Design a protein around this nucleic acid. Sequence first.
DNA 1: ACCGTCATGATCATATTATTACGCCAGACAGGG
DNA 2: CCCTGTCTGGCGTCCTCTCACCTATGATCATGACGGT
RNA 3: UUUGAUUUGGUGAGAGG
Lengths: 288, 251, 1340, 66
Amino acid sequence: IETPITANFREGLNVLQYFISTHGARKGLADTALKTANSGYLTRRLVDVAQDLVVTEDDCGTHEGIMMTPVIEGGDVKEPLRDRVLGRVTAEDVLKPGTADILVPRNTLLHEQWCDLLEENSVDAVKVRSVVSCDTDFGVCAHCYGRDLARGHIINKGEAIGVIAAQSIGEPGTQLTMRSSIQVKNKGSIKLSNVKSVVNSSGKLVITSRNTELKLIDEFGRTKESYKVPYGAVLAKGDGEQVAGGETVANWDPHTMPVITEVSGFVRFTDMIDGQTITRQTDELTGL
Amino acid sequence: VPLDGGRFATSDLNDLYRRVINRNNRLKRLLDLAAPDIIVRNEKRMLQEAVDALLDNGRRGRAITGSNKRPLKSLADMIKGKQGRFRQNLLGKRVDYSGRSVITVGPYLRLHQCGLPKKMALELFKPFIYGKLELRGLATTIKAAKKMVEREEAVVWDILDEVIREHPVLLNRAPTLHRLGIQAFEPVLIEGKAIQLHPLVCAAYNADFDGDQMAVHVPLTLEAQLEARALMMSTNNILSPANGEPIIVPS
Amino acid sequence: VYSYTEKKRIRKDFGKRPQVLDVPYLLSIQLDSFQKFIEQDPEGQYGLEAAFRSVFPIQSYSGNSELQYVSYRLGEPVFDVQECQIRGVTYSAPLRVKLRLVIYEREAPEGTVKDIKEQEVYMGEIPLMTDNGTFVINGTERVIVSQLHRSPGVFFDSDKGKTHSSGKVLYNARIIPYRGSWLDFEFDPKDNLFVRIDRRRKLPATIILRALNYTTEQILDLFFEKVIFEIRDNKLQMELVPERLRGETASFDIEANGKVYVEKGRRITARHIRQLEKDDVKLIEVPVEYIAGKVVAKDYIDESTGELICAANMELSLDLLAKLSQSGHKRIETLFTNDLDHGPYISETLRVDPTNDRLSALVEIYRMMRPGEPPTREAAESLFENLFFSEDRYDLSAVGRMKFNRSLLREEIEGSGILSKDDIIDVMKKLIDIRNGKGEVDDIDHLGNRRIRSVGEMAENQFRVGLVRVERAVKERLSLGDLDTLMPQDMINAKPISAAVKEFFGSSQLSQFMDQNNPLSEITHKRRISALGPGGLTRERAGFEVRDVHPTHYGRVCPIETPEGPNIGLINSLSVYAQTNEYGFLETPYRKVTDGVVTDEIHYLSAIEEGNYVIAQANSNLDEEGHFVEDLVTCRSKGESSLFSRDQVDYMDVSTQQVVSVGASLIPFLEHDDANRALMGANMQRQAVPTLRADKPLVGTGMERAVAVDSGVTAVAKRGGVVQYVDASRIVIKVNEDEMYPGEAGIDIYNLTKYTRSNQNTCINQMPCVSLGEPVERGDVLADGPSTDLGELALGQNMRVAFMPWNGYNFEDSILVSERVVQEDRFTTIHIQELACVSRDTKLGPEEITADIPNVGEAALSKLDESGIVYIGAEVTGGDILVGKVTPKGETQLTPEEKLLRAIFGEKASDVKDSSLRVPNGVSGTVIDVQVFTRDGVEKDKRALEIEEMQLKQAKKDLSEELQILEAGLFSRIRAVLVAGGVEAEKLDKLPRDRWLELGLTDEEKQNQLEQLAEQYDELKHEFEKKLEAKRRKITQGDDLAPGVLKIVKVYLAVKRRIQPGDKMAGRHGNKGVISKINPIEDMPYDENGTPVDIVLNPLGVPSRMNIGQILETHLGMAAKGIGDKINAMLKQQQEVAKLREFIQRAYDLGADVRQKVDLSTFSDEEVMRLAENLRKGMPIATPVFDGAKEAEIKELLKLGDLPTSGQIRLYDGRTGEQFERPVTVGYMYMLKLNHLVDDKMHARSTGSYSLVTQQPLGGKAQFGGQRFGEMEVWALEAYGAAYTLQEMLTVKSDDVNGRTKMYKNIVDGNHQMEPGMPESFNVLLKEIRSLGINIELED
Amino acid sequence: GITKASLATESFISAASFQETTRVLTEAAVAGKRDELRGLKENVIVGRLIPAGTGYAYHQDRMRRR
DNA sequence: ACCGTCATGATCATATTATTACGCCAGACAGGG
DNA sequence: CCCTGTCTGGCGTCCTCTCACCTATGATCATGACGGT
RNA sequence: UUUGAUUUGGUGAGAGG
Ligand SMILES: [Zn+2]
């Protein structure tokens, strides 16, 4: 509503302002009193899909597990690696970021002391054991689950993890709601992934691949920023380069899909006939 | 069973079975009498629809009804639904040795103990008090003990403080969402009629004190007392199982 | 000037806006609707006359008989309200109807009937309404609640977005009749037009246009324009109006008059349209490709062959043009089917149609209604004339015809109740216009489309359904009997009518049990706009938008008073000034702001008349004439608030209290509370309980007197005058002579209602509040009710509160209360429980109520009399015997000698077992009232004869005192008349007083008046004789009762529940709380005067739960008590009235331009002392809702008392005796006790009874039951490793019967051990699955 | 998806305590299905020790002694 | 005052029709390019 | 024959507390009150 | 060849958390 409620509660609200306030608050009470049914039915579906899964071994005997990286949406690094790899047992032994060192062994639980020795060495990402990669028939082994979470140690042989997991996902169901180009922020080094590129005539490295990931790696080794750069964008920078904080490093036009080339030469109209294939629309306000 | 009065409040299945038997008797009599084809086709069709209405009512076209327009409840409707046997009597049951009252604060408590009223304590612990009274030798038969606690003499409160002492109880707030909503305490007896609940523990139950109610349950057997002390005690739940964050945070 | 009870305690009033329309009578919806229902109403409608003239005359199955209608009449009820609530009857009135039977002859139904008969007939019993606005159905006072439903008429909704998953919106046009078959026109993604009738199968829409006897040529004449092609010598020229060409790209070069107008490849501009219409171009030239797809309108036939050239609604090709060109046709009529302007929806619809004439359309409609049966032309005509076009089965109301004409832009709002052809064609025209892009759709939640039914209209509809069942019965009987020998009471029977109206008032979804524990709760349950019930939506299905406040609830439906939980916004409460329109919509007052001046005339606007005009906000500043003092003023135009100029306004609101309801206008400082906390405050103010001595609100809104007087708990004076006799039972008013009838001499007697049971087990008392010899005015309180005081409304009590954290005992929301509160007996509420005991009739004989009872001794029977019933006054405990009743013996041991009765003793030797029916415990009390009802024929025992003699004696004394008191008033009238005209000063009292008529006086008005008083006196004599005989008949007779019951004993226990840790108290802003510790007096924080504070709240609930109004209420309450303490100081020192007059005048002026303006110079030195006697416990202050007391006025009133300006006193501690740092806030808050007590929720069970079908414990508290260890608790014990706890929690403690008896033996012997077994309810699951064709087992 | 996955289980009491019981009981009946219990809700239905918590030693013992 | 006639209450099988106004979301089915 | 609207079924939160309200009938032996002799 | 105290069902409406 274009006219706000300029009066607080210490000054008096008049009539219209309180009525607009009642719009805004009746919507919230209706949302909670109807949201609670979906939250409870979500907890029911979750504890009946889980329902069976019991910690029933001590090691499945595998070497597979998901690759825990810190998550980065495009702003500053949102959830650090110490939040994701706290108390989860590594899959293979993490190499120290210098060269080929056995920093941690390959079946160690990562409690707070190990995670601090991970944060000192600025470890990139940890290949850690996940429950979906567990090889145990009819249950989850004790290492592929992780830390007990309300006990400091590993999960005991027996403790029902499906039900506590289903409750822990569905329990915050009440608090949840129901109803141009790239500008860098920090100052570091450039790295490109999924890139197949070419240098244009002016010098800005344009990209012949749609799915290119533009990472900003710091001077230490960890990945601090990530972005998605489209097919055919004007990169102000290049691979492995050092930039300044706030300098624009990418540019494109999303309303005009570029059909840029790899080589040079002359242009011919192959199967382009005016009258059937293409049409003649001379511009009104420009003339070109 | 009859309700309070002189008539029998009959179940719906008796209507269903009585109709199937009425129709089956009619069909046997018509096959005795050699009625023509269309009569016994309607008779067997009414029996088919009667059996199909008995088993799963309303899966066929519009369900039959006795009183008044509401359809009557069949066997499959004794199984299925929110109020069948699974979701209403086998997964969740009503429970003896249990109680319920309004909560209040009582901040003098240590966080392994909760306040529990004397009237609820003498009602929930009637068999332990009976066993204690029969051990001392104050009475003889069970009747005498039930008269003693029906009168509430001066000697059963010492018996009650000697059955409480190291015996945990399960406090439970009514919308239990995660496992920290059932926690086991040790009772401390309360002159009053309200459960005194230690304040830090409230942030686990999502329990404010604006009119809330909680249920108490008594672990009867010995393995259940040990599970209440060793797994479900309130000192043992100081970290939320969803993460690593402490749940006994000062509110 | 002020009324005499307004000179008792005149409430201080802040407030700035001078009112112009006072609060109306708050119960006008119920009373006005039911007065509209039952009243002798001529000119047909509304009322019962509408039903009796729409279902009658019943004419027979061609037997030439007819049962027509004359009139109706309701006799008096046999039972008044008090006897009806005591005994348990309906409060009904018999409905006598005068019906007439006429019987026509042969060969002339337009001929003379041979015989008529007109007579009185009995049908049904409709329950009357009491003066409070409530019904008494079976001794329990019930309220029928107004329903909010959809307005009958057309409704053009748009199924937006969701269908077909391609964004193409649909448009449907639901015609909503008031009674009959629905009708939904709609579209489909192929842009065809589909009708449907009552959500049945779907047909193309034009099949009903053929059913109204339209040929296809006429249909295309209606729904399209025409395009004319003239074959004139060159390329089949065209008549062209260029308005159709607005933006169309032509296929050639349009030239005319030898001039190129339009080029090929371009579109026709608007200026080219101007050129062609300025030069008046008519005939243009088309190519052969232009009429390649033009759709012909009507049929062309060739004159030579007699065949069809081209059918109607067909595109034209080359060969069709070649055929019609050589047949002699020069004019070609086609249609204009554009992309944006006019789609060919009718044309595609007629191309999907298989039907061709009227008969096939009627056959297809008869086949979609009743599937699979042979149609016949007579049956199809009869069905389609009885769907929409008959007075019987289809009826829009006047509301329906108004909406149907208004939403189609008609002029006359009057029409027939049935549809016609023009109506359906206008629906299809408006639907096609909405699809074309002009015009708008209609929203649902807009209150111009939500009608309000009430008690009268719903009772009329249920009575009409009863009448159509009885017209089925009368049509059955009338032409299947011998005539003339019967009368019209042998035909019509009263069973379906009484069954229908008794089922509606008895158990409906809207005839609900009155929440009666408070005058506020009565007067806000009667004003309720429920959306649920029959014809409306349901809670567990819908929805989102209907639970939201629309912009047109402003001043009709309250935005902040609604129950939170599963139905928010469906159980809306109607606002204060909101009336109901003539049709049923909502309307609200406004003030007609003529061009400069706010004129003080009120003017009621509906919900759609409000939108067109522009309404000024309620609190806009104006300078003594009406001229708006600003030049930008905040207004709202069309559902949207904005800022408008000074003199473009058309209406102003009346008073600033009109957005809210009466539940949430007793909240002081409402504009400072966030809306959630105001909602919770209004709902808990409804949930209060009446205390023992209700005090007053120190900080009210002035709305208390409307809620108290305009409800029915106080004893309002009817005619003013002088009080003659006050008593705790009765009050006698002597009526003043300038208010008094000439005859029926008249002094009124108010019989108050002493201690009796309410519905919520409170104690509805009435206390007399007037002195003796005191004048009272017409319209004035005499007896305060429950939670009233001097005619005000005192729900809870006002106590000294401090906001400080005090050692944790008020942690989340808790409240900490001194023992000074419980010592003063000030929350000690009084509850009354009714305990019934019936004497049924079983086998081996009837029961015994006598006190010769087995298995009991002296200690039980000392509290009973010699006939079983407990005394009146015996203070009992929990588990004594109230009524002794013996029969329980069952069949412990089958009688050896079959039925050996006459052998040992008289009847039997106590069967085999005996146990006098002894009751439970948990509650104390004092037996205040015992009722004994006896089914007639049964021997009355000695106590039933004692109650009969008692009530005979009471009614005898009461009617004799009626005669004596009215005779005393009559003799006082005779003395008042004989002051002049033959006065005898000494001779008047020498003779006996009954002869004051034959004294010396001529034929004047005085001897005429003495003759009229002799007529009145002899009428009172014979009336007293016949009424005492009838009252002896009513006491002496039996009562009709249940099948097979001897006598019913009802006993009223009267518990007095005080306060304890665990009760729920709350203020009036949402500050809830369980009281957590009842401290001693010494521990309370006191101040540097000495007084302890009573209640210590918690400050931390204020910044999060944003209810900042309670702190302003606290400061203004402290100001009020400061003025009260200064009055108490100036009066305790025995000071003369001059200083009291000075100080009271200074405390009543004190403000800005306000409304009160009192002066004590016209109170005359005796009322000022009594006004100060009423002000010494504090000075009441009114603070209206949105025009309240600002901060500076509270500061100036805290400066009048010698209190600190900031409101905060420094407070010492009680324990340490040393000062709290940073001085704390004290004041008075008006706090309410709620009836969620703690000795009604607390429950405990070791081992009780067990259910029958599944061997699990019972549920509830009255049934001694156990708490449900539900499913999520089972999940929470699976989530730990607790395995034995869950095994005994669902096998031993709950279900397995041998397991739990082994458990009970093992617990009383000290061996904690369980033998598990199986749940018996799992065996019930096996029997229910096995009772199907399924074979479930248990292997191994 | 979770409701299609909990109704497609090799234990028909687990898939019958949850949503529609008609479909699951006819599928299990005409298949002749058998419920080797082996989970939490089968043992909450049938009234014995949970095979997760303290009862995991009891179910180790019973699974060893077959 | 006894005998006969009208009236009125027990027990007992007989077996189903004249409203509409949720919102997705899978899952199965006749239609047609 | 592979997309496709269209129709039919199947979900929709736990725990607790208070109150009221509960099918019609169509046919007959035998008891029960009323009037004549 | 003689020992026993035992059982209060659906439907719909409303409130608390
Ligand atoms: Zn594993």
